[PDB]
Design a protein around this motif. Structure first.
Motif, mmCIF file in Angstrom:
data_model
loop_
_atom_site.group_PDB
_atom_site.id
_atom_site.type_symbol
_atom_site.label_atom_id
_atom_site.label_comp_id
_atom_site.label_asym_id
_atom_site.label_seq_id
_atom_site.Cartn_x
_atom_site.Cartn_y
_atom_site.Cartn_z
ATOM 1 N N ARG A 1 -8.465 -24.431 73.774
ATOM 2 C CA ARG A 1 -9.130 -25.565 73.073
ATOM 3 C C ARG A 1 -8.527 -25.756 71.674
ATOM 4 N N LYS B 1 -1.065 -14.769 82.528
ATOM 5 C CA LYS B 1 -0.904 -15.708 81.384
ATOM 6 C C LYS B 1 -1.595 -15.134 80.142
ATOM 7 N N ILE C 1 -9.913 -13.456 81.978
ATOM 8 C CA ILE C 1 -9.859 -14.348 80.780
ATOM 9 C C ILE C 1 -10.649 -13.683 79.645
ATOM 10 N N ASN D 1 -12.088 -13.383 86.021
ATOM 11 C CA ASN D 1 -10.761 -14.050 86.124
ATOM 12 C C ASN D 1 -9.730 -13.341 85.233
ATOM 13 N N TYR E 1 -23.494 -20.774 73.228
ATOM 14 C CA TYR E 1 -22.939 -21.956 73.941
ATOM 15 C C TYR E 1 -23.196 -23.226 73.120
ATOM 16 N N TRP E 2 -24.462 -23.483 72.774
ATOM 17 C CA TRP E 2 -24.933 -24.738 72.125
ATOM 18 C C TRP E 2 -24.720 -24.694 70.606
ATOM 19 N N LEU F 1 -26.972 -18.673 75.639
ATOM 20 C CA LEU F 1 -27.369 -20.094 75.446
ATOM 21 C C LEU F 1 -27.175 -20.495 73.978
ATOM 22 N N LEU G 1 -20.452 -14.070 86.590
ATOM 23 C CA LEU G 1 -18.971 -14.229 86.647
ATOM 24 C C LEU G 1 -18.308 -13.473 85.483
ATOM 25 N N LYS H 1 -5.646 -13.273 85.442
ATOM 26 C CA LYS H 1 -5.318 -13.004 86.871
ATOM 27 C C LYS H 1 -3.971 -13.642 87.247
ATOM 28 N N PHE H 2 -3.539 -14.681 86.519
ATOM 29 C CA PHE H 2 -2.263 -15.415 86.748
ATOM 30 C C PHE H 2 -1.166 -14.913 85.797
ATOM 31 N N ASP I 1 -31.487 -16.000 83.265
ATOM 32 C CA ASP I 1 -31.672 -17.029 84.324
ATOM 33 C C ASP I 1 -30.878 -16.598 85.566
ATOM 34 N N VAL I 2 -30.822 -17.454 86.591
ATOM 35 C CA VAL I 2 -30.239 -17.140 87.932
ATOM 36 C C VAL I 2 -28.727 -16.885 87.813
ATOM 37 N N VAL I 3 -28.042 -17.539 86.866
ATOM 38 C CA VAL I 3 -26.565 -17.412 86.662
ATOM 39 C C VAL I 3 -26.264 -16.221 85.738
ATOM 40 N N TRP J 1 -27.485 -15.771 82.357
ATOM 41 C CA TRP J 1 -27.359 -16.199 80.936
ATOM 42 C C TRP J 1 -28.604 -15.767 80.153
ATOM 43 N N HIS K 1 -14.922 -20.376 72.954
ATOM 44 C CA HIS K 1 -14.431 -21.492 73.809
ATOM 45 C C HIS K 1 -14.839 -22.843 73.207
#
Ligand SMILES: CCCCCCCCCCCCCCCCCCCC(=O)O[C@H](COC(=O)CCCCCCCCCCCCCC)COP(=O)(O)OCCN
Ligand SMILES: CCCCCCCCCCCCO[C@@H]1O[C@H](CO)[C@@H](O[C@H]2O[C@H](CO)[C@@H](O)[C@H](O)[C@H]2O)[C@H](O)[C@H]1O
Ligand SMILES: CCCCCCCCCCCCO[C@@H]1O[C@H](CO)[C@@H](O[C@H]2O[C@H](CO)[C@@H](O)[C@H](O)[C@H]2O)[C@H](O)[C@H]1O
Ligand SMILES: CN(C)c1ccc(O)c2c1C[C@H]1C[C@H]3[C@H](N(C)C)C(O)=C(C(N)=O)C(=O)[C@@]3(O)C(O)=C1C2=O
Ligand SMILES: CCCCCCCCCC(=O)OC[C@H](CO)OC(=O)CCCCCCCCC
Ligand SMILES: CCCCCCCCCCCCCCCCCC
Ligand SMILES: CCCCCCCCCCCCCCC
Ligand SMILES: CCCCCCCCCCCCCCC
Ligand SMILES: CCCCCCCCCC[N+](C)(C)[O-]
Ligand SMILES: CCCCCCCCCC
Ligand SMILES: CCCCCCCCCC
Ligand SMILES: CCCCCCCCCC
Ligand SMILES: CCCCCC
Ligand SMILES: CCCCCC
Ligand SMILES: CCCCCC
Ligand SMILES: [Cl-]
Lengths: 1033, 156, 144, 48, 48, 48
Positions: free
Chosen positions: B113, B137, B104, B102, B46-47, B43, B69, B134-135, B34-36, B38, B79
Motif C-alpha cells: 500500500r 516474495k 505474509i 500465506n 483495522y478501523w 477491529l 487465517l 508462500k510465493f 467473532d466467527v472469523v 477477530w 496494511h
C-alpha cells in the motif's frame, strides 16, 4: 325550475327513473377493490448475478443500467440496491398522472440497448422491468401435510399445473410464485473431479455439447432435383429430459477404455433454482401464489373465480397437497360493503321515524324515502363517469355525505308542512311559496359546498389522491342532492302531501302526538325567549365564542396526526433479524421458536404461521426472516384481549427475552406506501466520489448528532445493512502463468463450484427449465475447502487452489444503496411526541449541513410527498374561503352578511376535537373529511336562518331582532330533525368494535361530537352573529 | 463467548470510546472473538481507533492475537496505514515478523500500500527485510512490481 | 404524431436489427432519441482559478453533472463538449515486438486481470448441518 | 449541449435544468463555475 | 431455426403465452407453433 | 356474430323504455306514451 316541475311531476319522475337506471347499471358494472391506486407510478428493474457480491453487482450491472436511464419522461427520482445475494433492484418513481405503461416501455427500451454492456451471466438470467405494486388481492398457500414433498417439489407443481390457470382466471392481473420451477442440479465432487483430472470447466463444456438443440435441415428441400417424391424435416440432437440422461453425459474416456460419466463426479437431482428462502406453513413445507387484481376488475368476483379454479384443480393434486388462504382482503371488503349499505338503509329508516315523529303523516315520510336513494344511485353513475371504483374511501365518502343528503330531503318537505300549517295554503300553492323561500339558498349552498370540497381534490402526491376520492364522491352526491331538491322533491310535495288547516299545529290531538306537539310548541317559545335574552347581552357571547375558538386551536395542536387508522385484518407480521454472519440454520431455530409460541400461547387466536427464512422487510440474507401470522375468524376472537394490537404487544414483549436476535410483531398499515405520519425518509449522498467508508463515517456522524436531540427526533436509524467480514482471495498471476494454469479456468472453477453456474436449459415433462452446476454443500463451506479444488494445467498436471492463491479477512458492504445515480445511505426516523414532521426535517437539514465536504442529502418517498403537499395547502384554504365568501355575497347581495354564516365553522370543529381527544383518536383523513361535512351542514343551517331573517327585513319590513327571532323559530324544527336522524345514524359507527371498526370509529366519533356542538351552539350563536354583523355594518 | 464480549466487539469497531470505557470497568472480555477470530483489538486496529487500541492493551488484550487465517492486529494496522496504532502495538510487544497462513508479514502489507512511514517504523523495531511469503516474495519484490521507487530505496 | 409511440415503434424495429450489428457497435451503445435538431441551451463549465485543464473539466461534467441532466424531463438529448476519462493504454510496437507480443495479447491480459469475479459464499445455501460461518468470497475486482 | 425533447416546454425544462445544476454547485471542486454562453429561453420570457 | 413445432411450443410459445396475463381489454389469444421453427401469437382486444 | 345476437334483446328493451320515458316527459302523460308504444308490434310484424 321547482315551479316548472311542480306543474310537471311526470317529467320530474322521468328524470328520477333515468338517474336510477344509470345508477342501477353503475352498481352492477363498477369495479370493486379495498383501496384505489394512490402511490405515484413506479417501475422496478430486477436482475440476478448468481454467486456475485454487492460490489460486483453494483460495478457491472447497477451503475451500467443507471448511466443508461436517460431521455425518459416525468422521472422524479431513481433509487437502487445491490446486495450479496447477487440481486439488484433499481426503482424509478414518476410524477403523479404519468401513464404507467409509457413509463415502463421507456425504461424497458433504455435497458434493452444497455443489455450488451452487462455481464453474459446477467444477460443469460435476464433483467425484469415491472410496474411496482405492493397490494395483493390474496396469497394462496400450497403445503404438503404427509411429508412426501419438499418446498422445491410443491413450487414445481404449482408452476406447472396451477400458476398458468390462475393467471387466466377472470379479473387476475399478475401472479407471483413463492418459489421456483425445478432446475437440473449437478452437485460436483472435487475429490472425484481431481481423481479423473477433470474440472467444473469440463462439466460445463460437456453439458453444453450433450444438452443442446442442433439445427439439421430437410430431405428433398428447395431447390430440389425434379422428380423428388418426399420432403421431410431432419431432426438431430434435441435437449435432454431426465436426471438419468444428465448422469450418462460422457466427460472422459480413460486409457484402458473405461468411461467417466457425469454421475461418477457429481450428484444429479431435480431441485430449486436457488436455496436462499426456506418457506414453512405451521412447520410443514410450503410454496404459494401472490395474486394481484387486474385494472378495472371486481375483487369479490375475482376471489370467487380464483377459488372456483382451485376447486376444479383439487382432484388432480398429489397426496398430501392442500390449499390454504393465509391472506385474503375480500372477506374484509365484503363486510365494508354490508356495513356501508346497512348505515345507508338505517339512515333512511331513522329519517322515516323522525319525519313521522314531527309531521305525523305517512305521505310526508315517503318523499325522503324516494329522494335519498335517487341521489345515492345517481352518485354511482357519476363515479362510473369519472372512472372511479367502489372502494373503502369512496364508500365512507358517501357515509360522510348522509347528513347533507338527508337535510336536502327534510328541509324541502318540512318547509312545505310549516307554510301549509301557518297559512292554510293547499299543497301545490304551499310548495310554490315554500320553494320560493329556499330555492335561491339551495343553489347558493351548492356553490358554497363546491367551494369547500372541490379544492380538496387538487392536493398532489399520495394523500392528494386519497382526498380526491372523498372530494369527487361528496361533491357529486351534494350536486345531485340539490338537483333532486329543485326538480323531484317539490313535484312529490305538491302531488303527495295532504293539506293542513291554518293554525293546526296538532296541539288538539290525543295520546303521544297530542302531548309531543304541545311539548314542542312550548319548547319553541322557551327557545325564542332564550334567544331574546341572549340578543340583549351579545357582548358576553362574543367573549364565549373567542374561548371556543381558542379551545379549538389548543385541541388541534394537541391531537396527534395520522393518515389512516390500523385495522384488525385477521393477519400481522413478525420480524426476525439475527446479527451479521448468522447462518440460515440459526435463523430457522429463532423462527421455529416464534412459530411454536403463536401455536401454543395464542392457539385460540392464531390459525397459521407462514415462516419465511432468508427474506426480511427491506434486506435479504441468511440472518433475516419473517413470520406472517394468520388469525381465526373475528367471531372466535371476542373482546380487545384477542385482537391484533393486544396479541402484537403480548408477542413483542415475550420475544424480548430471545438471545442473539431482534424479534418483534406489528400490525399491517391500511396502505403500505404512505408509511407513518411524523415519519420521514432521508437520503445521505456521496456527491464527490468520497467512497463507501467515508459516507459510512458521515452517516455515523449524523446518527450520533440526531441522538443528542431526543426532544425533536425519535428512532433515527439506517434502513440498510452494516459492513460484514468477507473472505478476500488473491490469485497470484505469476504463479498461474508459471504452472501453465489459465485464469479463466481458475475463476470458472471457483465461481461454478462455490457460487453456482447457470449452464443452459433442458425440457422437464414438456417445460423448459434451467441446468445449474455447483459444489455439493460439504466441499464449499470453509476456507480449508478452497485447497480441495484442483485446476488442470496446460501440461496436464492437476494444481490445487492453495498453490496459486492467498486469502485474508476484510470488511465490505453486503448491501450497497444508490440515489439518483450516486452512492447513498437511506436514513429513516420520525418527529418526537408533540413535534411536527416539518420541524424534525428542519433539524435533520441543520445537522446535515455540518457533515464533511462532498456529503449532500435529499428527501424521498413520503418526505418528498409531504413537502410538495404542504406547499399547496395555504393556496387551497385561501381559494376555498374566498369563493365561499364571494358565493354568499352574491346570494345575500352584501359584503358584510356573509361573515355571519362563516363564523359558524368553529362550533362544529370544537365538538369533533373534544370527541376525538376524549376517545383517544387521531387527526386522520376520515376525521378531516368529517370536519368539512360537519362544517358544511352547520353552514347550510346558518345560510337558511340568515336568508329567512334578511328576507323578512327586506320584504315584510321587519326589525333586525324581530326578523332574527321569527327566522330561528321557523328553522328550529328542521335543524333538530336532521341532527336527531344523523346523530342516531352515525351512533352504530362510534360503538362499532368489529372488523373495519377503526375506520368506522374515525368517521363516526368526529362527526357525532361535531354534530352535537354544531346543533346546540349554532341555534344560539347564528342569531348573535347576524345581529352583531348587521349592527356593525 | 458472553453478552458483554459482543458489545465490546461492536463498540471497539464503531470507535465508541465512552462505551469501551464503561465495558472495561464492567469487565467485558478483551479476548472475545467473532466467527472469523477477530478480537476487539483486531477491529480497533483495522478501523484506526487509537484510544480504544491503547485502552484495550491497558486491560490485558492479547497484542499477538491471530484470526482463523493467522493475521494479527499489527497486520491490519500496518496494511491500512494507521501509523500511531502500529507504534503503540510494537511498544506493547507486537511480533514485528508475525507470519499469516500465506507467509505474509506486516512489512509486506505496508510495502504493498506504499505506507513509507510505517515501513520505516517496522524496520526500526527489527522487521526481517529478507522475509519471503508462500510465493518467495519480499517487501522489496513488491516495491519494484508496484513501481514505488521511493519505497524500493528504503528497503535497499 | 405521439413522439412516445413514434420512439417505441422505431425501437421495436431497431431491436430486430441489433443482433446483426457488429459487437463493437452494440458495446458503444445505440441510442433512440426524440428531440429538436437545434440546441435549447449550452451549459458551459470553466475553472476561474485555472487549477483544472479542458480534459479535467470535461471528465468532471461527464462523471458528476451529465447523467442527472440527461435524466431531467424535457431533455431529449445531451452532448458533452469534451470526453469522459477512460483508462488509455498507449501501445509501443517496438517494445511489443521485442517481447514477441501483439495488441491481441494486451487485450487478452486486460480482460483476464481487469475482471470483477462472482466467487460465491462460504457457508452458502444450500449449506451443511451445523454451519456457523456465512461470508461473501471476494476474488478479482476492477482495477482503479 | 442540451436539446428539447419533442413537444416539451422550453422554459419549464430550462428551469428544471437550472434547479438540477443548483444541487451540484455546492460540491464543486475549488474554482469550477457554471457559465451560460448560449440560451434561447431568456428571449421568450423577456419578449412575452 | 431448425426446431420442430413441439420444441418451438415448449421453449418459445408457452414461455411467451404464460406472461400474457395482466393485459387490459384482451378478448382472446391464438398462436401457431410450426415445423419451420416459427411462432405467431395474435392477441385480439376489445372494440375501442 | 354471437355477441351481436346476445345483446340485441337488451338493446330493444332499453330502446323501447327510452322512447316511452321521452314521450312521458314531453307530453306530461302516462296514457299518451302507453297508447303510442302499443303500436310497435304493428310495425315489427311487417319487418319480420
Ligand atoms: C333491461 C333494461 C333494464 C331496465 C329495467 C326496467 C325499468 C322500467 C322503468 C321504466 C318505466 C316507467 C314506469 C311508468 C309508470 C307509470 C304509472 C302510470 C300510472 C297511471 O296509469 O296513472 C296515470 C295518472 O297517475 C298519475 O298522475 C301518476 C303521478 C305519479 C307518478 C306515478 C309513480 C311512478 C313511479 C315510477 C316508477 C319507478 C321505477 C324505478 C325504476 C294515468 O295516466 P294519465 O296520462 O291519464 O295521467 C294524467 C297526466 N296528466
Ligand atoms: C282541548 C281539547 C283537545 C282534545 C285533546 C286533549 C288532549 C289531552 C287528553 C287526551 C286523552 C289521552 O290522554 C293522553 O294519555 C296518554 C297515555 O297515558 C299520555 O301519554 C303521553 O304523555 C305522557 C305524559 O303525560 C308521556 O310520558 C308519554 O310518553 C306519552 O305517550 C298523554 O300525556 C295524555 O294526554
Ligand atoms: C361551554 C359549554 C356551554 C356553552 C353553551 C352556550 C349556549 C347554550 C346555553 C344557552 C343559554 C341561554 O340562556 C339564556 O341566557 C341569557 C343570558 O344572556 C338569559 O338572559 C338573561 O340576561 C339578559 C342580560 O342581562 C337579560 O336581558 C334577560 O332578561 C335575562 O333573562 C336568558 O334568560 C336565558 O334563557
Ligand atoms: C419473499 N417472497 C414473497 C417469498 C416467500 C416465500 C417463498 O418461499 C419465496 C419467496 C420469494 C421467491 C422468489 C424466487 C425468485 N424467482 C421468482 C424464482 C428468485 O429468482 C429467487 C432468487 N433469490 O433469485 C428466489 O429466492 C425464489 O426462487 C424463491 O425461492 C422464492 C421463495 O421460495
Ligand atoms: C364556510 C367556510 C369553510 C372554510 C373551511 C374550508 C376548508 C377547506 C380546505 C381544503 O380545501 O382542504 C381540506 C383538507 C384536506 O387536507 O381537509 C382538512 O384538513 C379539514 C379541515 C378542517 C379545519 C378547517 C379550518 C377551520 C379552522 C378554524
Ligand atoms: C366553484 C368552486 C371550485 C373552485 C376550485 C378551483 C381551485 C383550483 C386550485 C388551484 C391550485 C393552485 C395552486 C397554487 C400553488 C402555488 C404555490 C405558491
Ligand atoms: C375572504 C374574506 C374577504 C372579505 C372582504 C372584506 C369585506 C369587507 C366588508 C365591507 C362591508 C361594507 C359595509 C357597507 C359600507
Ligand atoms: C383574492 C382576490 C379577491 C378577494 C375578494 C374581494 C372582496 C371584495 C370586497 C369589497 C368590499 C367593498 C366595500 C364597499 C364599501
Ligand atoms: C354565483 C354564486 C351563487 C349565488 C347563487 C344565488 C342565487 C340567487 C337567485 C335569487 N333568485 C333570482 C332566485 O331570486
Ligand atoms: C358481485 C358484484 C356486484 C355487487 C357489488 C356490490 C355493490 C354495492 C355497492 C354499494
Ligand atoms: C335558560 C335555559 C333555557 C333553555 C331554552 C332552550 C330550549 C330548547 C329546546 C328545543
Ligand atoms: C330527459 C327527457 C327529456 C325529453 C322530453 C323533453 C321535455 C320537454 C317538456 C316541455
Ligand atoms: C325551466 C326549465 C327547467 C327544466 C330543464 C331541466
Ligand atoms: C368506467 C368506464 C365507462 C364509463 C361510462 C361512461
Ligand atoms: C321550455 C321547455 C324546457 C325544455 C327542457 C329540456
Ligand atoms: Cl468505494
Amino acid at each position: 325550475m321547482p315551479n316548472f316541475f311542480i306543474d310537471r311531476p311526470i317529467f320530474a319522475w322521468v328524470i328520477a327513473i333515468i338517474i336510477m337506471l344509470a345508477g342501477g347499471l353503475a352498481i352492477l358494472k363498477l369495479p370493486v377493490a379495498q383501496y384505489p391506486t394512490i402511490a405515484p407510478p413506479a417501475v422496478t428493474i430486477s436482475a440476478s448475478y448468481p454467486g456475485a457480491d454487492a460490489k460486483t453487482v453494483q460495478d457491472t450491472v447497477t451503475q451500467v443500467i443507471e448511466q443508461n436511464m436517460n431521455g425518459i419522461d416525468n422521472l422524479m427520482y431513481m433509487s437502487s440496491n445491490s446486495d450479496s445475494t447477487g440481486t439488484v433492484q433499481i426503482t424509478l418513481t414518476f410524477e403523479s398522472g404519468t401513464d404507467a405503461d409509457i413509463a415502463q416501455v421507456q425504461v424497458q427500451n433504455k435497458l434493452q440497448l444497455a443489455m450488451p454492456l452487462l455481464p453474459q451471466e446477467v444477460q443469460q438470467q435476464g433483467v425484469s422491468v415491472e410496474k411496482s405494486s405492493s397490494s395483493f388481492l390474496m396469497v394462496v398457500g400450497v403445503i404438503n401435510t404427509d411429508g412426501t414433498m419438499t418446498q422445491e417439489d410443491i413450487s414445481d407443481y404449482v408452476a406447472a399445473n396451477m400458476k398458468d390457470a390462475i393467471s387466466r382466471t377472470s379479473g387476475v392481473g399478475d401472479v407471483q410464485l413463492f418459489g421456483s420451477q425445478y432446475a437440473m442440479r449437478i452437485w460436483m465432487n472435487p475429490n472425484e473431479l481431481n481423481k479423473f483430472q477433470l474440472t467444473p470447466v469440463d462439466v460445463i463444456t460437456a453439458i453444453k455439447a450433450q444438452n443442446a438443440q442442433v439445427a439439421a435441415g430437410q430431405l428433398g428441400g428447395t431447390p430440389p432435383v425434379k422428380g423428388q417424391q418426399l420432403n421431410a424435416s431432419i431432426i438431430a440432437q434435441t435437449r435432454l429430459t431426465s436426471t438419468e440422461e444428465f448422469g450418462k453425459i460422457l466427460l472422459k474416456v480413460n486409457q484402458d477404455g473405461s468411461r467417466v460419466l457425469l454421475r461418477d463426479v457429481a450428484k444429479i437431482e431435480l431441485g430449486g433454482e436457488n436455496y436462499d428462502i426456506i418457506a414453512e406453513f405451521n412447520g410443514q413445507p410450503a410454496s404459494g401464489l401472490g395474486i394481484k387484481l387486474a385494472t378495472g376488475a371486481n375483487a369479490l368476483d375475482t376471489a370467487a373465480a380464483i377459488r372456483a379454479e382451485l376447486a376444479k384443480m383439487e382432484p388432480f393434486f398429489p397426496s398430501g397437497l392442500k390449499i390454504v388462504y393465509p391472506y385474503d382482503t375480500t372477506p374484509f371488503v365484503k363486510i365494508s360493503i354490508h356495513e356501508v349499505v346497512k348505515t345507508l338503509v338505517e339512515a333512511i329508516i331513522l329519517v322515516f321515524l323522525v319525519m313521522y315523529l314531527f309531521l305525523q303523516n305517512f305521505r310526508a315520510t315517503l318523499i325522503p324515502t324516494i329522494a335519498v336513494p335517487v341521489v345515492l344511485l345517481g352518485t354511482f353513475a357519476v363515479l362510473a363517469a369519472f372512472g372511479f371504483s367502489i372502494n373503502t374511501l369512496t364508500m365512507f365518502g358517501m357515509v360522510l355525505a348522509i347528513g347533507l343528503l338527508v337535510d336536502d330531503a327534510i328541509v324541502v318537505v318540512e318547509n312545505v308542512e310549516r307554510v301549509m300549517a301557518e297559512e292554510g295554503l293547499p299543497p301545490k300553492e304551499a310548495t310554490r311559496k315554500s320553494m320560493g323561500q329556499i330555492q335561491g339558498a339551495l343553489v347558493g349552498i351548492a356553490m358554497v359546498l363546491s367551494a369547500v370540497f372541490v379544492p380538496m381534490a387538487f392536493f398532489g402526491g399520495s394523500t392528494g389522491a386519497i382526498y380526491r376520492q372523498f372530494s369527487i364522491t361528496i361533491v357529486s352526491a351534494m350536486a345531485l342532492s340539490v338537483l333532486v331538491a329543485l326538480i323531484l322533491t317539490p313535484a312529490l310535495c305538491a302531488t303527495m302531501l295532504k293539506p293542513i288547516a291554518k293554525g293546526d299545529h296538532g296541539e288538539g290531538k290525543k295520546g303521544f302526538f297530542g302531548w309531543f306537539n304541545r311539548m314542542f310548541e312550548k319548547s319553541t317559545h322557551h327557545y325564542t325567549d332564550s334567544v331574546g335574552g341572549i340578543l340583549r347581552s351579545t357582548g358576553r357571547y362574543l367573549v364565549l365564542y373567542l374561548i371556543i375558538v381558542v379551545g379549538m386551536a389548543y385541541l388541534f395542536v394537541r391531537l396527534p396526526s395520522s393518515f389512516l387508522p390500523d385495522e384488525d385484518q385477521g393477519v400481522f407480521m413478525t420480524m426476525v433479524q439475527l446479527p451479521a454472519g448468522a447462518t440460515q440454520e440459526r435463523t430457522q431455530k429463532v423462527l421455529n421458536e416464534v412459530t411454536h409460541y403463536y401455536l401454543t400461547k395464542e392457539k385460540n387466536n392464531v390459525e397459521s404461521v407462514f415462516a419465511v427464512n432468508g427474506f426480511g422487510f427491506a434486506p435479504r440474507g441468511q440472518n433475516t426472516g419473517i413470520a406472517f401470522v394468520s388469525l381465526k375468524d373475528w367471531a372466535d376472537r371476542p373482546g380487545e384481549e384477542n385482537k391484533v394490537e393486544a396479541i402484537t404487544m403480548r408477542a413483542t414483549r415475550a420475544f424480548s427475552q430471545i438471545k442473539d436476535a431482534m424479534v418483534f410483531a406489528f400490525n399491517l398499515p391500511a396502505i403500505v406506501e404512505l408509511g407513518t405520519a411524523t415519519g420521514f425518509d432521508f437520503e445521505l449522498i456521496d456527491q464527490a466520489g468520497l467512497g463507501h467508508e467515508k459516507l459510512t463515517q458521515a452517516r455515523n456522524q449524523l446518527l450520533a448528532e440526531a441522538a443528542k436531540h431526543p426532544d425533536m427526533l425519535t428512532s433515527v436509524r439506517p434502513n440498510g445493512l452494516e459492513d460484514t467480514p468477507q473472505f478476500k482471495i488473491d490469485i497470484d498471476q505469476e504463479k498461474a502463468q508459471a504452472l501453465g494454469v489459465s485464469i479463466n479456468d481458475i475463476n470458472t472453477t471457483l465461481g461454478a463450484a462455490w457460487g453456482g453456474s447457470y449452464v443452459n436449459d433442458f425440457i422437464d415433462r414438456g417445460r423448459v427449465k434451467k441446468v445449474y452446476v455447483m459444489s455439493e454443500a460439504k466441499y464449499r463451506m470453509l476456507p480449508d475447502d478452497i485447497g480441495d479444488w484442483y485446476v488442470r494445467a496446460a501440461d496436464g498436471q492437476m494444481v490445487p487452489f492453495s498453490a496459486f492463491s492467498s486469502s485474508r479477512w476484510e470488511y465490505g458492504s453486503p448491501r450497497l444503496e444508490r440515489y439518483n445515480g450516486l452512492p447513498s445511505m437511506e436514513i429513516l426516523g420520525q418527529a418526537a411526541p408533540g413535534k411536527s414532521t416539518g420541524e424534525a426535517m428542519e433539524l435533520m437539514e441543520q445537522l446535515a449541513s455540518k457533515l464533511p465536504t462532498g456529503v449532500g442529502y435529499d428527501w424521498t418517498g413520503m418526505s418528498y410527498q409531504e413537502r410538495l403537499s404542504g406547499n399547496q395547502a395555504p393556496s387551497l384554504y385561501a381559494i376555498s374561503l374566498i369563493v365561499v365568501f364571494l358565493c354568499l355575497a352574491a346570494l345575500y347581495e352584501s359584503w358584510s352578511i356573509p361573515f355571519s354564516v362563516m363564523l359558524v365553522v368553529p362550533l362544529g370543529v370544537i365538538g369533533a376535537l373534544l370527541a376525538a381527544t376524549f376517545r383517544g383518536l387521531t387527526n386522520d383523513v376520515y376525521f378531516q373529511v368529517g370536519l368539512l361535512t360537519t362544517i358544511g351542514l352547520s353552514a347550510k343551517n346558518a345560510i337558511l336562518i340568515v336568508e329567512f331573517a334578511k328576507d323578512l327585513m327586506d320584504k315584510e319590513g321587519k326589525g333586525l331582532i324581530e326578523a332574527t327571532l321569527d327566522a330561528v323559530r321557523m328553522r328550529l324544527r328542521p335543524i333538530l330533525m336532521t341532527s336527531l336522524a344523523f346523530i342516531l345514524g352515525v351512533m352504530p359507527l362510534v360503538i362499532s368494535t368489529g372488523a373495519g371498526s377503526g375506520a368506522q370509529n374515525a368517521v363516526g366519533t368526529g362527526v357525532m361530537g361535531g354534530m352535537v356542538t354544531a346543533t346546540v351552539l349554532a341555534i344560539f350563536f347564528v342569531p348573535v352573529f347576524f345581529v352583531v354583523v348587521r349592527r356593525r355594518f | 463467548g458472553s453478552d458483554l464480549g459482543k458489545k465490546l466487539l461492536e463498540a471497539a469497531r464503531a470507535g465508541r470510546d465512552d462505551e469501551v470505557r464503561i465495558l472495561m470497568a464492567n469487565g467485558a472480555d478483551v479476548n472475545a472473538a467473532d466467527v472469523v477470530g477477530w478480537t476487539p483489538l483486531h477491529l480497533a486496529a483495522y478501523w484506526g481507533h487509537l484510544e480504544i487500541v491503547e485502552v484495550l492493551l491497558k486491560n490485558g488484550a492479547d497484542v499477538n492475537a491471530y484470526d482463523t487465517l493467522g493475521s494479527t492486529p499489527l497486520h491490519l494496522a500496518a496494511h491500512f496505514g494507521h501509523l500511531e496504532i502500529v507504534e503503540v502495538l510494537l511498544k506493547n510487544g507486537a511480533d514485528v515478523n508475525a507470519k499469516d497462513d500465506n507467509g505474509i508479514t506486516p512489512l509486506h502489507l505496508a510495502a504493498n500500500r506504499g505506507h513509507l512511514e510505517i515501513v520505516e517504523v517496522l524496520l526500526k523495531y527489527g522487521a526481517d527485510v529478507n522475509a519471503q511469503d508462500k510465493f518467495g516474495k519480499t517487501a522489496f519484490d513488491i516495491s519494484i512490481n508496484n513501481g514505488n521507487e521511493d519505497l524500493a530505496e528504503i528497503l535497499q
